[PDB]
Amino acid sequence: ASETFEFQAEITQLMSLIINTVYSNKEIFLRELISNASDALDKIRYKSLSDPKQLETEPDLFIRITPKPEQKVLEIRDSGIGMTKAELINNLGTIAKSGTKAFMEALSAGADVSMIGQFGVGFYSLFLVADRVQVISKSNDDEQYIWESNAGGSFTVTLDEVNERIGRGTILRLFLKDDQLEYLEEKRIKEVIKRHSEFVAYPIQLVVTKEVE
Numbered sequence: 001a002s003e004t005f006e007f008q009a010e011i012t013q014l015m016s017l018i019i020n021t022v023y024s025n026k027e028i029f030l031r032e033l034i035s036n037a038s039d040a041l042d043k044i045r046y047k048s049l050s051d052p053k054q055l056e057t058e059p060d061l062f063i064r065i066t067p068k069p070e071q072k073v074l075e076i077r078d079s080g081i082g083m084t085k086a087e088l089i090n091n092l093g094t095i096a097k098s099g100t101k102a103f104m105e106a107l108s109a110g111a112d113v114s115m116i117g118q119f120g121v122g123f124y125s126l127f128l129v130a131d132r133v134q135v136i137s138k139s140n141d142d143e144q145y146i147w148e149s150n151a152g153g154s155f156t157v158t159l160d161e162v163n164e165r166i167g168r169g170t171i172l173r174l175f176l177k178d179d180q181l182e183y184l185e186e187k188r189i190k191e192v193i194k195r196h197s198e199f200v201a202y203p204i205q206l207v208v209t210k211e212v213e
C-alpha cells in the first residue's frame, strides 16, 4: 500500500519556517492553491489542442472548493492535468526546488510572505493554515494516488483505494489548524477569492451544505 520518501533538506527548512509563523496575510494560501489549479487547467486545455481525446476523462474545466467543517478539512478541487505517481514524488520533492533557498533568504531580509508565489514554492504556503495535507491526484497517464505530509522530513505516497474517483485532476485536502477554521465559512472563502483570485479563466465552484429550511 503506502510508501515513504524523504523531503529534500531545504524544503523541510522551508515547511518548518512557514508552519512556525505569525503573519496576518495567511489567506494568501488560497490565492496560491487557486493559481496552481488554474495553471493545471491551462496545461490540460493546451495539451488537448493537439490531442482532443485528452479532455475525455473529465470534460468540464472547473475549480471547486469544498469546506467540510464536520472534520476541520478544506478541499480545493480542479479538473486540471493531474500528476502521476512519478510526478508526485519528484515534484513534491525529494528533488531540490530552485526558489527554495532563495526565498527563505528573501524572508529573513524582510520579504512579505505573499512573495512565495513569485519564488515558485507557493504550494508550501498551505502550511500556513494546515498541518496535514493530502494531495490526491489522478492523471490520464496513471492511477489515482494520495500524497501525504504532516510537514515532517518525509512524506507518504499510496495508491488511492480510499477516496472517490476524480475523472482527471487533483484535490488538495487540507487538515486545518484550530485557529484557522474561518476558512470553512462561506462568507470568508467568498471574501478571499474576491480580493485575490479576481482574474481567473475557469469557473470557481463553492460547495455549500444547507440543512433543509
Ligand SMILES: CO[C@H]1/C=C/C=C(/C)C(=O)NC2=C(C)C(=O)C(NCCN(C)C)=C(C[C@@H](C)C[C@H](OC)[C@H](O)[C@H](C)/C=C(\C)[C@H]1OC(N)=O)C2=O
Pocket (backbone or CB within 6 Å): 036, 037, 039, 040, 043, 078, 080, 081, 082, 083, 087, 091, 092, 120, 121, 122, 123, 124, 135, 169, 170, 172
Ligand atoms: C498542488 O499541486 C501543484 C503542484 C505543486 C508544485 C509546487 C511544488 C509549487 O510550489 N510550485 C510550482 C508551481 C506553482 C507551478 O505552477 C509549477 N508549474 C510549472 C512551472 N515550470 C517550472 C514548468 C511548478 C513546476 C511543477 C511542479 C509543475 C507540475 O509538475 C510538472 C504540473 O505542471 C502541475 C500543473 C502542477 C501544479 C502547478 C499543481 O497541480 C495542481 N493540480 O494544483 C511548481 O513547482
